[PDB]
Amino acid sequence: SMKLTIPELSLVVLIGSSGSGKSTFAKKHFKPTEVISSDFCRGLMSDDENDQTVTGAAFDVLHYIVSKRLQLGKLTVVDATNVQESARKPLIEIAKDYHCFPVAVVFNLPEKVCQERNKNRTDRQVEEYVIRKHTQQMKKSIKGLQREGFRYVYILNSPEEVEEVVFERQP
Amino acid sequence: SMKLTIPELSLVVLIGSSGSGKSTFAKKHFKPTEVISSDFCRGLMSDDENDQTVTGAAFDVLHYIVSKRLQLGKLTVVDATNVQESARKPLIEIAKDYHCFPVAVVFNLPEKVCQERNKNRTDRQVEEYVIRKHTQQMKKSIKGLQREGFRYVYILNSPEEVEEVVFERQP
Numbered sequence: 001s002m003k004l005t006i007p008e009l010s011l012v013v014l015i016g017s018s019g020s021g022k023s024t025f026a027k028k029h030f031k032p033t034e035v036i037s038s039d040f041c042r043g044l045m046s047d048d049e050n051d052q053t054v055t056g057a058a059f060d061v062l063h064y065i066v067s068k069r070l071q072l073g074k075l076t077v078v079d080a081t082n083v084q085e086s087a088r089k090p091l092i093e094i095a096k097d098y099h100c101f102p103v104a105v106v107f108n109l110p111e112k113v114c115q116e117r118n119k120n121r122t123d124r125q126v127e128e129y130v131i132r133k134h135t136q137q138m139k140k141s142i143k144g145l146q147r148e149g150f151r152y153v154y155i156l157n158s159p160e161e162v163e164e165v166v167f168e169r170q171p
Numbered sequence: 172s173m174k175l176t177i178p179e180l181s182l183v184v185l186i187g188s189s190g191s192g193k194s195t196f197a198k199k200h201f202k203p204t205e206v207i208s209s210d211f212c213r214g215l216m217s218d219d220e221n222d223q224t225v226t227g228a229a230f231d232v233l234h235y236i237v238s239k240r241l242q243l244g245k246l247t248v249v250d251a252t253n254v255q256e257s258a259r260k261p262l263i264e265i266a267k268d269y270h271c272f273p274v275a276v277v278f279n280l281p282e283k284v285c286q287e288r289n290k291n292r293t294d295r296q297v298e299e300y301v302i303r304k305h306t307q308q309m310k311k312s313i314k315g316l317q318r319e320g321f322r323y324v325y326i327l328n329s330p331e332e333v334e335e336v337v338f339e340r341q342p
């Protein structure tokens with residue numbers, strides 16, 4: 001197993017393209033209420049599925065909910081693409097403000113893997129250019145993550161490594 | 172500052188080319204007794220600085236000294252180049268055997284920075300080809316370190332980042 005150590009009070013930031021398996025991973029490894037997804041926050045603003053017209057509001061709500069959970073000392077996982085630096089920075093700042101370790105878990109999978117899983121999704125799907133872009137952004141992000149403020153940086157380089165993951169929480 | 176978290180009982184493996192500043196870094200951050208260097212272990216086998224028959228035995232001696240330290244629950248830093256997988260493999264196994272976290276600290280510095288320090292060294296120097304080879308090996312090593320068994324992988328990408336390091340011994 002790939003043992004990934006996280007402190008009992010952490011902000012776990014999932015980083016990966018649409019289709020990289022973040023929400024699948026989150027559900028496998030964490031309790032439902034520990035996981036806050038951008039999709040869930042969008043659904044609070046709109047009964048339409050994946051409504052793109054409320055994106056700004058959805059992410060504001062995500063930040064707010066995350067900050068309130070950390071305030072109460074509760075480990076939180078952020079389930080969003082997080083491939084842009086502008087997306088990760090507020091999470092880092094929130095974590096620092098609540099004296100919580102931000103942790104990066106990166107889904108460094110080949111583009112083709114996400115493109116392939118995308119075409120077979122039942123919930124929703126995106127165009128191929130979106131996953132190409134997401135994958136480029138993710139790859140560009142990897143080097144600078146520690147410097148951005150992530151205390152622990154876990155890069156998963158293949159589906160097998162993702163599968164093998166086991167989290168060890170330390171209090 | 173770049174805060175790098177290490178458990179109280181860790182095997183810290185320095186990874187970097189000759190000239191990358193490993194020994195200097197080890198001296199700044201750790202106690203002299205905590206640090207076991209390949210140069211020291213060679214010295215135990217020969218006063219002759221240019222002996223290559225000694226290398227195997229000196230690595231055996233280093234592994235054993237590290238083993239006995241970790242068995243005694245004493246944090247140990249391996250000050251050797253460690254740019255080859257065959258050199259890291261026994262270190263990881265040793266850490267695992269004494270239920271210690273192996274930590275990788277990688278001096279991901281440009282070849283030219285290492286070559287220049289080496290030129291300016293007054294204690295002992297290596298040939299330029301050695302540093303060219305180390306740097307390529309260090310670079311090829313980065314991606315696989317987590318998979319090799321390192322529990323925390325810390326990549327230092329510039330002299331400034333190296334200089335900014337603060338170790339935090341919490342877990």
Ligand SMILES: Nc1ncnc2c1ncn2[C@H]1C[C@H](O)[C@@H](COP(=O)(O)OP(=O)(O)OP(=O)(O)O)O1
Binds near residue numbers: 023081122159
């Ligand atoms: N390890 C896996 N092996 C095979 N299929 C997988 C794996 N993980 C996820 N999938 C499938 C489930 C889905 O149909 C599809 C996308 O997974 P999902 O977890 O929704 O990605 P995601 O949450 O990263 O995308 P988005 O960012 O669009 O929410 O891939």
Ligand SMILES: Nc1ncnc2c1ncn2[C@H]1C[C@H](O)[C@@H](COP(=O)(O)OP(=O)(O)OP(=O)(O)O)O1
Binds near residue numbers: 187195291292293297
């Ligand atoms: N951060 C730094 N800034 C400027 N000069 C440095 C720095 N670190 C080391 N040096 C200089 C001092 C030494 O004369 C020279 C080599 O450093 P040293 O710590 O001996 O490297 P090393 O331990 O990685 O080499 P080797 O693997 O050959 O033992 O470089």
Ligand SMILES: [Mg+2]
Binds near residue numbers: 022023024079
């Ligand atoms: Mg998802």
Ligand SMILES: [Mg+2]
Binds near residue numbers: 193195250
């Ligand atoms: Mg040295």
Ligand code: NA
Binds near residue numbers: 195196199334
């Ligand atoms: Na130093």
